[PDB]
From TrEMBL:
Alphabetized InterPro entries for the sequence: GH, Glyco_hydro_1
Keyword Transmembrane belongs to the record: no
Domain of life the protein comes from: Bacteria
Lineage: Bacteria, Bacillati, Bacillota, Bacilli, Lactobacillales
Natural source organism: Streptococcus pyogenes serotype M1
One BP annotation, GO: carbohydrate catabolic process
Family the entry assigns: Belongs to the glycosyl hydrolase 1 family.
CC annotations in GO: cytosol
Record keywords: Glycosidase, Hydrolase
Gene Ontology MF terms: beta-glucosidase activity
Protein name: Beta-glucosidase
PANTHER family, sorted: 6-PHOSPHO-BETA-GLUCOSIDASE GMUD (PTHR10353:SF139), GLYCOSYL HYDROLASE (PTHR10353)
Length: 461
């Protein structure tokens, strides 16, 4: 089993999850949340130290190259790089930190891949304006991104505007797992819109810069996991069909095709929840599409027709039109209550092939979280994470079938190289190829890392 030439191999992380708040000038939504309610975080570990990459980025990258990685994706924190949001002034220390990060990639022969926003809106922006509810903030985010392009576009040729903006939509305005953790469909939907707008506006800005800083590729990091219907009935089918229009299609269509999905707009109007837009806005969005995409995948989704239809709703919610469905006999990860079903990666590959023009995309996150890794140390102290190996392998296998079948997939990233801080779960579940001891910050490669090195170095399975 062999992969194309130039295939990205490596893993993904983020600024907020790897750095620590060392020297960080502002607080992002999660930093604020942790200072206010540290009881909400597993074992009371918040993001102050996280995985210490503010100190250890250089040695991390050396370890990763020695483990066969040719690329690395992390994120630049709005709250680290920018002094004054309003004018996007530069914080020199912030600036010197990310240059260390870029230069250390290149220096180790690791293509630097950069995301601009990973659930880390500055709290001050939410307080003043309602954050992503505001098109002003969208402008500030746009200004933040020109700075990055200006300062890093010389070395960084691979840009992504958001990590999974629907997760922000949901966590913040629907399911209560991002601050502000409010329930409000109307705000959810507008914020969806703004994130999509931000995306086109950022892509616009990137593409206006001088030749030497705009000869890279830019896109966004989405999801495309299917919503498998419980059966082939027409009510279950309509449920899945909606689950995808909301969960997958809304952002996918904006990024790849220049448009929002009509069917979805009609439902939103019929429900008095449609977003405020501007024909000038819709055109920027038509004009600025991604060069490419990352799709993250951890678990399938499964839906049925709702057991109960309510006549009045406190708040609007795509979950009107569907319920979760468990499939008798499915394989599962207990620690996380997630179904393991790698075949879905093949389906994601085909869906890109036939419905999003087979534009290039990579699998930007794939990984498995387990919670007591100390139980799998061998007499050498190393974690023997045979489960992680099997998981990554199976998903990689299907990704291969997907490529073999004509899908324009250029890469695979494991979430995550070194155990990192997973939000409310913190360090409960570990995802890393390389162990991290959150007390001493000492890294230490698990079996999975050596299996992955073999895969990466020889470009095959």
């Amino acid at each position: 089993l062999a992969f194309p030439k130039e295939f990205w191999w490596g893993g993904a992380t983020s600024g907020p999850q790897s750095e620590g708040r060392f020297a960080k000038q502002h607080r992002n939504l999660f930093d604020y949340w942790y200072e206010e309610e540290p009881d909400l975080f597993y074992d009371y570990v918040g993001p102050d130290t996280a995985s210490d990459a503010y100190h250890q980025i250089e040695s991390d990258l050396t370890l990763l190259a020695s483990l066969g990685h040719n690329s690395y994706r992390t994120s630049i924190q709005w709250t680290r790089l920018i002094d004054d949001f309003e004018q996007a002034t530069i914080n020199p220390d912030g600036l010197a930190y990310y240059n260390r990060v870029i230069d250390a990639c290149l220096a180790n022969g690791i293509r630097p891949v950069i995301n601009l926003h990973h659930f880390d809106l500055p709290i001050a922006l939410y307080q003043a304006y309602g954050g992503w509810e505001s098109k002003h903030v969208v402008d500030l985010f746009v200004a933040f991104s020109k700075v990055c392009f200006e300062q890093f576009g010389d070395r960084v040729k691979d840009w992504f505007v958001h990590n999974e903006p629907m997760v922000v939509v949901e966590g913040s305005y629907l399911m209560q797992f991002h601050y502000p953790a409010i329930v409000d469909g109307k705000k959810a939907v507008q914020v969806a819109y703004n994130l999509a707008l931000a995306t086109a506006k950022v892509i616009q800005a990137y593409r206006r810069g001088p030749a030497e800083l705009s000869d890279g590729r830019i896109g966004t990091i989405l999801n495309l996991t299917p919503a498998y219907p419980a059966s082939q009935s027409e009510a279950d089918m309509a449920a899945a069909h909606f689950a995808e229009l909301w969960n997958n299609d809304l952002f996918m269509e904006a990024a790849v095709h220049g448009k929002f999905p009509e069917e979805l707009v009609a439902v939103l109007k019929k429900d008095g929840v449609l977003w405020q837009s501007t024909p000038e806005e819709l055109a920027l969005i038509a004009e600025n599409r991604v060069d490419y995409l990352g799709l993250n995948f951890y678990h399938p989704k499964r839906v049925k027709a709702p057991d109960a239809i309510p006549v009045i709703s406190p708040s609007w919610s795509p979950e009107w039109y569907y319920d979760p469905y468990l499939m008798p006999g499915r394989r599962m990860n207990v620690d996380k209550g997630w179904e393991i079903y790698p075949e879905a990666v093949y389906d994601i590959a085909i869906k890109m092939r036939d419905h999003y023009d087979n534009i290039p995309w990579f699998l930007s996150e794939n990984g498995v979280g387990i919670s007591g890794e100390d139980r799998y140390r061998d007499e050498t102290g190393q974690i023997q994470d045979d489960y992680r190996i099997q998981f990554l392998k199976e998903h990689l296998t299907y990704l291969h079938k997907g490529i073999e079948a004509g899908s324009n997939c250029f890469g695979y990233h494991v979430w995550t190289p070194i155990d990192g801080w997973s939000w409310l779960n913190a360090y409960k579940n570990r995802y890393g190829l390389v162990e991290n001891n959150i007390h001493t910050q000492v890294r230490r490669p698990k079996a999975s890392a050596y299996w992955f090195k073999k895969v990466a170095t020889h470009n095959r399975l």
